[PDB]
Write a protein that binds this ligand. Structure first.
Ligand SMILES: *[C@@H]1O[C@H](CO)[C@@H](O[C@@H]2O[C@H](CO)[C@@H](O[C@@H]3O[C@H](CO[C@H]4O[C@H](CO)[C@@H](O)[C@H](O)[C@@H]4O)[C@@H](O)[C@H](O[C@H]4O[C@H](CO)[C@@H](O)[C@H](O)[C@@H]4O[C@H]4O[C@H](CO)[C@@H](O)[C@H](O)[C@@H]4O)[C@@H]3O)[C@H](O)[C@H]2NC(C)=O)[C@H](O)[C@H]1NC(C)=O
Ligand SMILES: *[C@@H]1O[C@H](CO)[C@@H](O[C@@H]2O[C@H](CO)[C@@H](O[C@@H]3O[C@H](CO)[C@@H](O)[C@H](O)[C@@H]3O)[C@H](O)[C@H]2NC(C)=O)[C@H](O)[C@H]1NC(C)=O
Ligand SMILES: *[C@@H]1O[C@H](CO)[C@@H](O[C@@H]2O[C@H](CO)[C@@H](O[C@@H]3O[C@H](CO)[C@@H](O)[C@H](O)[C@@H]3O)[C@H](O)[C@H]2NC(C)=O)[C@H](O)[C@H]1NC(C)=O
Ligand SMILES: *[C@@H]1O[C@H](CO)[C@@H](O[C@@H]2O[C@H](CO)[C@@H](O[C@@H]3O[C@H](CO)[C@@H](O)[C@H](O)[C@@H]3O)[C@H](O)[C@H]2NC(C)=O)[C@H](O)[C@H]1NC(C)=O
Ligand SMILES: *[C@@H]1O[C@H](CO)[C@@H](O[C@@H]2O[C@H](CO)[C@@H](O[C@@H]3O[C@H](CO)[C@@H](O)[C@H](O)[C@@H]3O)[C@H](O)[C@H]2NC(C)=O)[C@H](O)[C@H]1NC(C)=O
Ligand code: NAG
Ligand code: NAG
Ligand code: NAG
Ligand code: NAG
Ligand code: NAG
Ligand code: NAG
Ligand code: NAG
Ligand code: NAG
Ligand code: NAG
Ligand code: NAG
Ligand code: NAG
Lengths: 462, 132, 132, 132, 51, 52
């Protein structure tokens, strides 16, 4: 009855992994023009199916804020983005004394279109031509040490040199269905309720994650997934005022944004080869840039969130304030609709605060009433705070229209010792990590560890 | 449902099926662990490392015997300090995942013992080959 | 003329010599399939892939048995749907190149059958080891 | 002092201990020979080459038989031109380092002979399997 | 001529540009076959085919 | 410098015109440099003009 040891190769067990995943691009964004598509050219296309498992009785511990995978995602985006823009459009020649004047002035929305004349190097380096480019607001900075004169400078001349964009490249989020390397596997929670951490029950295997479209945005997160059953409010520590609350909504809300003014485009050859693009002149009338949002659906949302939020903050009213203040990159919502960069002023979106009863009362109506936010567009931006990767946008002609189904929310919390009857929430954001963390959380990466041991009692004759 | 393809082409499917289940299936798991500008390095490293791990495991199996069967008896008895459970409990109720949380201790003890029983066998075989 | 060096250090020399010829020579072919700024990636990829293919084939041989002999009997009978030729025709007249054009069907059927006969053998062996 | 870890985790420790010593230890040496911007290529090449060498040696061992035992009898007699020493002299006084300076000649003769004795064995086995 | 196009280079003055035959070799696992046949129209069933 | 002691003479005050953040604007700036990096300008005649 003596027990003897046997070895079992290939046993189904695992340990937490610390490795990397890879593209897994969608194999549909591939066409000849893929070389002109950002973050697709570089990637390998795949088409894998979902996995059946279901590991039965098996349960597992997940933790969204400890999943290192998000950093891999961040780091690659920074480096892929940066690499894709190297062989083109250095704009150093632009940083010359610039001369400019007012639109008409009058309406503030027209004043901003500064006609900006300057001398640029021609195909012959000896010859110089006087040319003008339409520019607006922030990129045009009063020249240092002048005295309210017509002399201006480009914003980046006191910083580092910037680029524009390779004009051929498309920047549109393509989902990447990240796949595991051999020896690794991905696990996912199919559980609702899940606070962002803890012992998920029915835990499916994953060969490749469901693809996630990278998005650059803050505050409201668009083109994302929905909660399956109910709004999910998730936070690393709800009692820590320094943390950001991530909210997954159950139903979609629709946002419609646009830029009304027909805009023409021109280009300037600077020295050899490379051309520069800029607005010729906004060719129509100049009207505001906005985002339509239905009021109904937004007032339904704020209370529904308040109801769920109330669970962690009981017997209190939920109030929504505006941002703390700062640069538009800090306080405004940011969109890249159509490839143009919009910064939209959140007030009065989150102006309201409903009594902690959150009664879901509304009614049928023929009303089409909306809440409209107004937007300010930029030409030069620090992409992901990449001042050292600063870039000038290419202009786009005609009028921009832009949908869609939103949103994930990024919120913070406030209120002092002088309240505690209500708490105040504010718009928050700026860390790209949370934008992806929001969806990446579903998955955990593990390593398969074959070769284990067990007694059997059976013995080898030899 | 599932079946072997999902369980072992995919991974860990039997983890919840208790270890006795494994006796009929631990095959495929092994074969699917050997599958296949700057990103070229990332990919090459991943490929190379998978190979190195695979081969290192094969080397250990070789050293201990038997070894091409994937399940081998190594003729080493169990230390009583490791015999706190019945075989039926181990094989019918426990999982590999579960066993592995506790039996995780004394890993190198086992490996040492396995290597040595094989070393002795080999000498005994050479002596018999010499006599024969 | 030629000889084994050219035939199998080099490749496919026996392809025209009919498959019975192979019984005396399929050795060298295997060993010579395992030989060894930006071009560094091209070369590393080529090397790595050759290794991966080699190892994957070895894994299949292992799973099916027997397997270190390069020629193994796996104790699986032929399905009559595959028995439209005499053995003499197969071994003396046909080439591997030729056989492989038709026998190419039902590849996974064979692999499935080979894997399973081995799985059954292993259980039977463990039961005998347990009894013995 | 030292011990196996330093001798074979580290390398060549037994080189001075005469070859008879090796009979109890040539195990670990094998496993530790399989361990694991532009520098990425240098490192990948190093890793890949180590793997290729390892596998190529395994392939030769396979071809000659026996081969998983690391020490095998291949049933090839010694040519008298190679028998200028007594076995006691070879095993008790000489080192592997030393033997290898002289026995270095006729390397491929041995390899040829080993490959062929195995080829003949395999045919004989198939004939017996056919009869049986 | 190139001022209205893209910038050009001259040549690294030290570099020799002379055709050197490259006897391209196969990777392990591959082999190259060749036709020793005349008549061959550029396509078709070559008879004596060397490795 | 002052000249006098050889160890002081060497500290040559070196004025030059450098490109400003605006490429069109130019500023006159000086940098202290000493001995070998400062080379009498080729083809001058013991003048105040030097080259790097
Ligand atoms: C984002 O969200 C904002 C809202 O926050 C939204 O702005 C609204 O856009 C709509 C687009 O249709 C605007 O609608 C127009 O509104 C005018 C204003 O009329 C109002 O006020 C007058 C009195 O001052 C009332 O009599 C009238 O009933 C309204 O209350 C309407 O006059 C427009 O309809 C007419 O004009 C159209 C052409 O301009 C005609 O095609 C249409 O048939 C109507 O004609 C009427 O007036 C004619 C005058 O020539 C007359 O000839 C006809 O016989 C008839 O009487 C239209 O409803 C709305 O005002 C905007 N609201 C504000 C304050 O901005 C953005 O559009 C939205 N952006 C998106 C979609 O992304
Ligand atoms: C921005 O400023 C520039 C000047 O630096 C404006 O371009 C100038 O526009 C005026 C009026 O259109 C042009 O005057 C006209 O010239 C044509 C011949 O070219 C003549 O036939 C007309 O009778 C009239 O004199 C001026 O030439 C033109 N200068 C150029 C070519 O640079 C530009 O329109 C301003 N843009 C905006 C949107 O404010
Ligand atoms: C979020 O998701 C919505 C819905 O998919 C996206 O809307 C899409 O926006 C793209 C912009 O690249 C549209 O493509 C454009 O089509 C026009 C022709 O209509 C073409 O001229 C443009 O150059 C470009 O190809 C796409 O049609 C549009 N889809 C729909 C159905 O509206 C939106 O872009 C996504 N991102 C954001 C910031 O919302
Ligand atoms: C957040 O929402 C509240 C409630 O809508 C805003 O307070 C209200 O704002 C409206 C619009 O300005 C006020 O109506 C206006 O009042 C003035 C002054 O009497 C009158 O001249 C206008 O014709 C119009 O009637 C309203 O009185 C005011 N108060 C309430 C309780 O409705 C608040 O301004 C919003 N804040 C933000 C951040 O936008
Ligand atoms: C190297 O040469 C430069 C001149 O190219 C010297 O800088 C100059 O130093 C003199 C004396 O310190 C400055 O004169 C003073 O100017 C101030 C106003 O800036 C005035 O209040 C004083 O009464 C006096 O006139 C001169 O401005 C200054 N020039 C500049 C700013 O470049 C530099 O000191 C010399 N360095 C050495 C170490 O020899
Ligand atoms: C879970 O364990 C129970 C009891 O052993 C068993 O009946 C059931 O089939 C197991 N489920 C899975 C799929 O592991
Ligand atoms: C451009 O060149 C013209 C003619 O040489 C000159 O009058 C004008 O001032 C220059 N403008 C700038 C800002 O360099
Ligand atoms: C450039 O000038 C702006 C305006 O004064 C200033 O805010 C910014 O800090 C300056 N950047 C540098 C690095 O000089
Ligand atoms: C997890 O539980 C849900 C409950 O709705 C079930 O639909 C799902 O199939 C389970 N696992 C998988 C494979 O999603
Ligand atoms: C829920 O989240 C909190 C932090 O917000 C965490 O400490 C806790 O472990 C999570 N799980 C449970 C049991 O709610
Ligand atoms: C937001 O808080 C400030 C105080 O910091 C207060 O003055 C302001 O009225 C609040 N806005 C609201 C009511 O949303
Ligand atoms: C945003 O809008 C509010 C209300 O009009 C205004 O008071 C505030 O100054 C605006 N902030 C920005 C970003 O200009
Ligand atoms: C070709 O086939 C014939 C008939 O089987 C055989 O005699 C001849 O040796 C073969 N030639 C070669 C070199 O394959
Ligand atoms: C050296 O050789 C002598 C004589 O065979 C032996 O006694 C001694 O142990 C050897 N030393 C070592 C460590 O090789
Ligand atoms: C450069 O000038 C020549 C002569 O007119 C012309 O043929 C050529 O197309 C021009 N190239 C460009 C791109 O301007
Ligand atoms: C909707 O909720 C806000 C508070 O966020 C409140 O001010 C407003 O009166 C509510 N309106 C409806 C539709 O009941």
């Amino acid at each position: 009855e003596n027990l003897w040891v046997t070895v079992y190769y290939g046993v189904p067990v695992w340990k937490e992994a610390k490795t990397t995943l890879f593209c897994a691009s969608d194999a549909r964004a591939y066409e000849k023009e893929v070389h002109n598509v950002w973050a697709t050219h570089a990637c390998v296309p795949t088409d894998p199916s979902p996995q059946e498992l279901v590991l039965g009785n098996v349960t597992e511990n997940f933790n969204m804020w400890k999943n290192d995978m998000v950093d891999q995602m961040h780091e690659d985006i920074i480096s892929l983005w940066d690499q894709s823009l190297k062989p083109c459009v250095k704009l150093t020649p632009l940083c010359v004394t610039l001369i400019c004047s007012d639109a008409t002035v009058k309406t503030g929305t027209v004043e901003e279109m500064k006609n900006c004349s300057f001398n640029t190097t021609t195909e012959i380096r000896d010859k110089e031509k006087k040319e003008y480019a339409l520019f607006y607001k922030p990129d045009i900075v009063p020249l240092s040490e002048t005295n309210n004169t017509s002399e201006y400078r480009l914003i980046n001349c006191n910083t580092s040199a910037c680029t524009q964009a390779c004009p051929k490249v498309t920047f549109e989020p393509i989902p990447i269905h990240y796949c595991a390397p051999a020896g690794y596997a991905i696990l996912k929670c199919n559980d609702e309720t899940f606070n962002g951490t803890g012992p998920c029950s029915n835990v499916s295997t994953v060969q490749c994650t469901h693809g996630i479209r990278p998005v650059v945005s803050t505050q409201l997160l668009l083109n994302g997934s929905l909660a399956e059953k109910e709004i999910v409010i998730r936070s690393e520590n709800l009692t820590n005022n320094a943390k950001i609350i991530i909210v997954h909504l159950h139903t979609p809300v629709e946002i419609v944004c646009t830029r009304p003014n027909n805009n023409t485009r021109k280009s300037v050859r600077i020295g050899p080869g490379q051309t520069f693009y800029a607005t010729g002149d906004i060719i129509g009338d100049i009207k505001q840039a906005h985002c339509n949002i239905s009021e109904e659906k937004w007032n339904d949302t704020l209370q529904k969130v308040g109801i769920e939020l109330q669970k962690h903050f009981p017997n209190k009213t939920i109030k929504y304030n505006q941002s703390a203040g700062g640069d538009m990159e800090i306080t405004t919502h940011s969109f890249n609709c159509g490839g143009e960069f919009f910064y939209c002023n959140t007030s009065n979106l989150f102006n309201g605060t409903y009594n902690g009863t959150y009664i879901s009362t509304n009614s049928s109506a023929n009303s089409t009433s909306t809440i409209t936010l107004q937007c300010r567009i930029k030409q030069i931006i620090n992409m992901w705070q990449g001042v050292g990767r600063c870039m000038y946008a290419p202009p786009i002609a005609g009028n921009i229209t832009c949908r869609s189904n939103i949103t994930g929310l990024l919120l913070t919390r406030d209120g002092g010792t002088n309240s505690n009857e209500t708490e105040t929430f504010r718009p928050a954001g700026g860390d790209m990590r949370d934008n992806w963390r929001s969806e990446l959380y579903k998955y955990k990466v593990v390593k398969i560890e074959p070769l284990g041991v067990a007694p059997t009692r059976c013995k080898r004759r030899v | 449902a599932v079946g072997i393809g999902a369980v072992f082409l995919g991974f860990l499917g039997a983890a919840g099926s208790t270890m006795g289940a494994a006796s009929m299936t631990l095959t495929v798991q092994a074969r699917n662990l050997l599958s296949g500008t700057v990103w070229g390095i990332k990919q090459l490293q991943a490929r190379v490392l998978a190979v190195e791990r695979y081969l290192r495991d094969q080397q250990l199996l070789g050293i201990w015997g038997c070894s091409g069967k994937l399940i081998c008896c190594t003729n080493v008895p169990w230390n009583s300090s490791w015999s706190n459970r019945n075989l039926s409990e181990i094989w019918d109720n426990m999982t590999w995942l579960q066993w592995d949380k506790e039996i995780s201790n004394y890993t190198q003890i086992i490996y040492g013992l396995l290597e040595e029983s094989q070393n002795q066998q080999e000498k005994n075989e050479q002596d018999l080959l010499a006599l024969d």
